[PDB]
From Swiss-Prot, chain A:
Range of the intact protein held here: 1 to 147 of 625
Signal peptide start and end residues: none
Notes on the domains: The N-terminal domain (about residues 1-143) is an archaea-specific tRNA-editing domain that has a highly similar structure to Dtd (D-aminoacyl-tRNA deacylase); the domain binds L-serine and L-cysteine and most D-amino acids but not L-threonine. Editing of incorrectly charged L-seryl-tRNA(Thr) by this domain is tRNA catalyzed.
Protein's name in the database: Threonine--tRNA ligase
Effect of H83A: Isolated domain has decreased to no deacylation of mischarged L-seryl-tRNA(Thr). Deacylates correctly charged glycyl-tRNA(Gly)
Amino acid sequence: MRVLLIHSDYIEYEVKDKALKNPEPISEDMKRGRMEEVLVAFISVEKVDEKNPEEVSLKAIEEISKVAEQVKAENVFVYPFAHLSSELAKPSVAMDILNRVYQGLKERGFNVGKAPFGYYKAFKISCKGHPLAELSRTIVPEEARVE
Amino acid sequence: MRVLLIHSDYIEYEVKDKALKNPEPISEDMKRGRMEEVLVAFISVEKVDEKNPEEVSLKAIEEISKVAEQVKAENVFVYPFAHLSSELAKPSVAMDILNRVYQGLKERGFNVGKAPFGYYKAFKISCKGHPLAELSRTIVPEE
Ligand SMILES: Nc1ncnc2c1ncn2[C@@H]1O[C@H](CO)[C@@H](NC(=O)[C@@H](N)CO)[C@H]1O
Ligand SMILES: Nc1ncnc2c1ncn2[C@@H]1O[C@H](CO)[C@@H](NC(=O)[C@@H](N)CO)[C@H]1O
């Protein structure tokens, strides 16, 4: 999994065309969204992640939480972004992992937002530009799955 | 080299603290800048690129210019973005390579901008959201 962390003043998105023949169904309310004073987590689910989906999600929740604490962000935005990697995991698995992370983050008590999976989206972001406002993490499975 | 191309309505940046002890010297005018209707090329130069700087540069110039043609973008902005890779090249080489890519695009007749190298920078961007508005490319030399 590849993760690009951007501490921003805001993040806005607007769903455009479907990128997958059949993407995650959503309502009018989800077409667009906006968060402020937020740590934006652009995430690319890689093939390897298919090995131990649960392991990776936990790892990412941990890594993402740590940066949030460091930069002191109470808001985190999970953003499906399939361009941080060129070895992508299949959609079904990707959407699942992305959901766990999101869920795991709310479990940590952060205010969390997200963009819908499987669409091309327009977006506007404003990175603060501090030493810690731009970070990356590569998280891969290191254990066998048990299911 | 890891390249992330974002066709945008605009791009804005403002140089903040230094990220290197010896960053690209700049003036006040360069401290900040803005381009509109532009293909932004976020680039992280990798250690492997060090093997053949010229080669990587050429391929990047052809890939970028190609996507520039596809989205009909006349403006291109070269934006140093280390965090696209975890195996970054030596600064001196990254700098030279970025300049090669800058000049190479400039040569093709595009209006090219280039953000300063070696600093932490705040920025604002607006991605159009079209099918080809977000693309990535990995470009390494032929070993
Ligand atoms: N491995 C993966 N990691 C993260 N996201 C993935 C994915 N595979 C599919 N997607 C989702 O499908 C859209 C088109 O690939 C993806 N959309 C995007 O990456 C938008 N930024 C395009 O504008 C995303 O919603
Ligand atoms: N291999 C490399 N590829 C691209 N850029 C590189 C580099 N090595 C050094 N830099 C420059 O130094 C700043 C801190 O690493 C980098 N700054 C940045 O990546 C900003 N986006 C931080 O806000 C960049 O200017």
